[PDB]
Every structure is written in structure tokens, then in C-alpha cells.
Amino acid sequence: PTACRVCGGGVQEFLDLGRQPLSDRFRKPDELDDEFTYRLAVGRCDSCEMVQLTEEVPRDLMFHEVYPYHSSGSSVMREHFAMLARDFLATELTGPDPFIVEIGCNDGIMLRTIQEAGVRHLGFEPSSGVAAKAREKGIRVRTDFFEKATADDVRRTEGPANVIYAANTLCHIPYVQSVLEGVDALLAPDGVFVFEDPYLGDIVAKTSFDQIFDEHFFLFSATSVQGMAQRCGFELVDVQRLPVHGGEVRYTLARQGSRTPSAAVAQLLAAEREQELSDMATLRAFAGNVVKIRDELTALLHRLRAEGRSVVGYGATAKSATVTNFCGIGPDLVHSVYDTTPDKQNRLTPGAHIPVRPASAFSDPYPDYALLFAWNHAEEIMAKEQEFHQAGGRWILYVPEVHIR
Ligand SMILES: Nc1ncnc2c1ncn2[C@@H]1O[C@H](CSCC[C@H](N)C(=O)O)[C@@H](O)[C@H]1O
Numbered sequence: 001p002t003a004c005r006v007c008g009g010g011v012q013e014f015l016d017l018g019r020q021p022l023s024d025r026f027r028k029p030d031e032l033d034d035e036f037t038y039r040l041a042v043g044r045c046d047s048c049e050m051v052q053l054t055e056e057v058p059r060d061l062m063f064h065e066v067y068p069y070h071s072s073g074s075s076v077m078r079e080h081f082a083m084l085a086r087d088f089l090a091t092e093l094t095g096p097d098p099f100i101v102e103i104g105c106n107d108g109i110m111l112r113t114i115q116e117a118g119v120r121h122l123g124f125e126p127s128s129g130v131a132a133k134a135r136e137k138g139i140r141v142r143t144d145f146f147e148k149a150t151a152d153d154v155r156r157t158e159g160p161a162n163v164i165y166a167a168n169t170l171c172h173i174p175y176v177q178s179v180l181e182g183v184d185a186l187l188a189p190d191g192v193f194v195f196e197d198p199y200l201g202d203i204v205a206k207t208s209f210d211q212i213f214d215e216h217f218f219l220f221s222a223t224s225v226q227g228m229a230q231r232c233g234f235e236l237v238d239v240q241r242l243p244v245h246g247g248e249v250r251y252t253l254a255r256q257g258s259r260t261p262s263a264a265v266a267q268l269l270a271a272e273r274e275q276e277l278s279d280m281a282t283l284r285a286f287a288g289n290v291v292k293i294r295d296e297l298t299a300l301l302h303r304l305r306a307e308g309r310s311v312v313g314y315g316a317t318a319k320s321a322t323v324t325n326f327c328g329i330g331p332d333l334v335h336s337v338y339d340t341t342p343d344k345q346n347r348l349t350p351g352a353h354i355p356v357r358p359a360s361a362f363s364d365p366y367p368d369y370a371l372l373f374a375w376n377h378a379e380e381i382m383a384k385e386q387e388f389h390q391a392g393g394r395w396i397l398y399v400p401e402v403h404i405r
């Protein structure tokens with residue numbers, strides 16, 4: 001049995017996705033076929049209800065000099081983070097000399113707006129190649145992990161932060177207690193720690209098991225985040241559901257008692273309770289539906305091949321490593337994957353070794369079908385790929401069900 005990373009409680013497994021590769025490792029075709037693998041399985045703590053993986057991948061295996069995800073590759077996300085930055089400039093960052101720290105700034109998708117407002121800030125970005133892209137934009141960035149000690153160092157030299165923000169980062173960090181002790185050291189007494197990450201309620205409702213992989217250690221809910229804050233000196237004082245990345249919640253933590261929670265917190269807590277979101281039976285039902293999607297997806301991809309139809313994929317997502325490796329889906333069924341990220345092109349996907357080609361290569365003559373791994377970006381991708389569909393090309397989705405359209 002594994003100990004909960006939040007409270008030390010016991011974690012009960014409910015889904016085992018088997019042996020998996022690093023999701024963001026893209027190999028050159030000529031590289032030795034040797035990969036780090038680990039067991040990906042997910043459990044729920046008995047005491048605090050935190051849904052979490054049962055085996056940690058060490059941070060430095062995932063995040064380092066060549067980490068390939070470039071946030072600013074999606075226009076929807078550029079706009080989503082610009083808007084969030086302007087909202088913070090209008091509310092939490094209005095004093096004399098405000099200071100915002102972002103955990104996991106990546107290429108500077110959010111902090112660019114803060115920098116262009118002349119607000120003092122610092123991005124933590126331990127993946128140095130994307131850090132350098134943020135620094136090219138004028139952003140102040142430290143190429144370190146946020147944790148207790150690096151938070152203390154920033155408090156020492158920069159003073160308190162009015163906002164600490166983390167998007168698609170806190171749930172990557174098993175050492176969430178260290179991060180919380182760092183937020184406690186660094187946050188102003190009237191500041192907020194705000195984070196947004198894939199939401200358990202969405203994962204369960206959409207059976208989007210691809211949101212489960214090495215970099216998503218936690219699948220947060222309002223119930224577990226409320227517990228986590230409380231256990232650590234903070235309080236959950238707002239929630240906002242976001243449509244990005246398949247469904248997220250943005251959580252606002254304050255020092256306990258310093259602000260009164262919005263009605264939104266209790267409403268979401270009560271909906272989670274009402275729908276038995278984190279009950280083990282629900283979480284098992286979700287696991288059973290994950291297997292049903294596997295079996296339906298592979299039967300379709302097999303039938304397409306038997307009927308002489310070409311199939312490729314669209315989006316070399318981190319997410320897709322779970323799909324191809326759990327389902328057994330390799331270049332015999334999905335010939336290539338198209339992606340706009342230069343450092344993933346002319347590479348093979350992890351585990352399954354499907355070749356990745358630039359999206360500019362997805363063009364007449366089109367394949368019959370494209371398996372949409374970037375299904376959280378459907379609207380943005382399809383708007384750019386209307387010629388494909390007008391030609392008769394069709395999308396295969398596996399969220400929330402296997403279907404073609
Ligand atoms: N302890 C830590 N502190 C700060 N950044 C971290 C971290 N562990 C991982 N990261 C960074 O967290 C990032 C997660 S990817 C998400 C990036 C971006 N905020 C977005 O929403 O698109 C990677 O860039 C990774 O290097």
C-alpha cells in the first residue's frame with residue numbers, strides 16, 4: 001500500500017493502466033528502443049479523498065532541458081492566460097509594487113502580460129529550454145523547481161508575493177506539501193495561491209483516462225483540495241470551472257479565515273457529494289468504462305484497417321502516451337501523428353513509436369481518418385483543418401465515447 005502524499009492516509013487503487021513510458025519523451029527514429037517505464041495506476045486516499053497515482057516518476061526524469069511542451073502553441077490557451085493575467089492585474093495586483101510568482105511558467109504564456117504591464121514578477125521553470133523562450137520575451141525566470149527552500153530564497157531577496165499562480169503544474173508535483181510550505185513562506189498575508197488543473201469531475205464524466213499519465217500525479221476535486229488547504233494552513237475560498245484541457249477547476253487558496261469563501265465553493269462541494277464523485281464505487285465504474293473505451297477503440301481501428309482505410313493521429317499529446325500504450329496502438333494501426341511542435345517532429349511517440357510529422361504535412365491527399373488525440377483543442381484544430389473534413393476526411397474521437405464525425 002502507498003501513503004497519501006497529502007495526509008499520509010492509505011491510498012486504495014481503482015485503475016491500473018499498466019506499464020507506461022515517459023509521456024513527454026520523443027525519440028529519434030534511430031535511437032535504441034530502450035525506455036524508462038513505470039507502473040501507472042491511480043488510487044484514492046482513505047482519509048482526505050485525494051485521487052493520486054501510486055508510483056511517482058522522479059521530477060528530473062520529466063522536467064529538464066529538453067522538455068517539449070510549448071504552452072504557447074494554442075491560440076485558445078494564449079488568450080485564456082492573457083485574460084487571467086489581466087484579471088489579476090485588475091484585482092490582486094493593484095497595490096504599490098505588487099509581485100506575482102508563477103509556478104511552471106513554461107514559455108511565458110501568462111507572465112508575458114504581467115511583464116508588459118511592468119509588474120514585478122518571477123517565473124519558476126525548471127525545464128530550461130522553455131525557460132529560455134520565456135526569458136526571450138523579457139520575463140524574469142528562475143530555472144529551478146518551486147519547493148520550500150526555493151520559495152524561502154525568493155522571500156528573502158524579493159519579499160512577499162501578492163499572487164502565487166500555477167496552471168497545469170500543481171497536479172504534476174507529488175511533493176505538494178513542500179510546495180505548500182513554500183507558498184506559506186512566500187505569500188503575502190492577504191495574498192492568494194491560485195491554481196488550475198484537470199478536474200476529477202470532468203475526467204469521470206467524460207471517461208477521459210488520457211488525462212492520467214506520469215505528469216498528472218493528482219486528479220484534484222474541490223473536496224480533496226478543500227481538505228488539502230485546510231490541513232496545510234489555507235482555505236479554499238473560490239472555485240471556477242474552466243473548459244480548457246478537457247475540463248478544469250481553478251482553485252483559490254487564502255490563509256485560513258482571511259477571506260470568506262464564495263458561494264461557489266460550497267455549491268461545488270455539495271454537487272460532488274451529491275453525485276458521489278469521489279466514492280470508490282464511482283471511481284471503479286469510471287475504471288470499467290476506461291476498459292470499455294479501450295476495447296471499442298481498438299476494435300474500430302482494427303476494422304478500419306481490415307476495410308482498407310488509412311488512419312493517422314492528430315496532436316502528439318503527452319496524453320496520447322496513455323492511449324497508445326494502454327490500448328496497444330502502434331504504427332500498424334495509426335501510421336503517423338501530426339503536430340505543430342518542432343521538437344516533437346521527426347521523432348517517434350513514446351512506447352508505441354508512431355512517427356510524428358509536422359502538421360503542415362497533413363494536407364491533400366488526406367487520410368481517410370484522423371484519430372484526434374488533441375481532442376481538448378478540437379475547435380481550434382478543426383477550424384484550421386476544414387479542407388480535410390470538406391474532402392471527406394473524418395475525425396475519430398474516444399472522448400467521451402468512441403465515435404466518428
Ligand atoms: N516544482 C516545480 N516548479 C515550477 N515549475 C515546475 C515544477 N515541476 C514542473 N514544473 C514545470 O511545470 C510545467 C508544467 S506544463 C504547464 C505549463 C503552463 N503553465 C500551462 O498551463 O500550459 C513544465 O514547464 C515544468 O517544467
Ligand SMILES: Cc1cn([C@H]2C[C@H](O)[C@@H](COP(=O)(O)OP(=O)(O)O)O2)c(=O)[nH]c1=O
Pocket residue numbers: 069073074075314315316317318319320338339340341344359374375376377380381384
Ligand atoms: C492547438 C494545437 C495543438 N497541436 C499539438 C501541439 C501539442 O503537441 C498537442 C496538444 O497538446 P495539449 O492537448 O495541449 O497537451 P498534452 O501534451 O498535455 O496532451 O497538439 C497542434 O498540432 N495543432 C494545434 O492547432
Ligand SMILES: [Zn+2]
Pocket residue numbers: 004005006007008009045046047048049050
Ligand atoms: Zn490523504
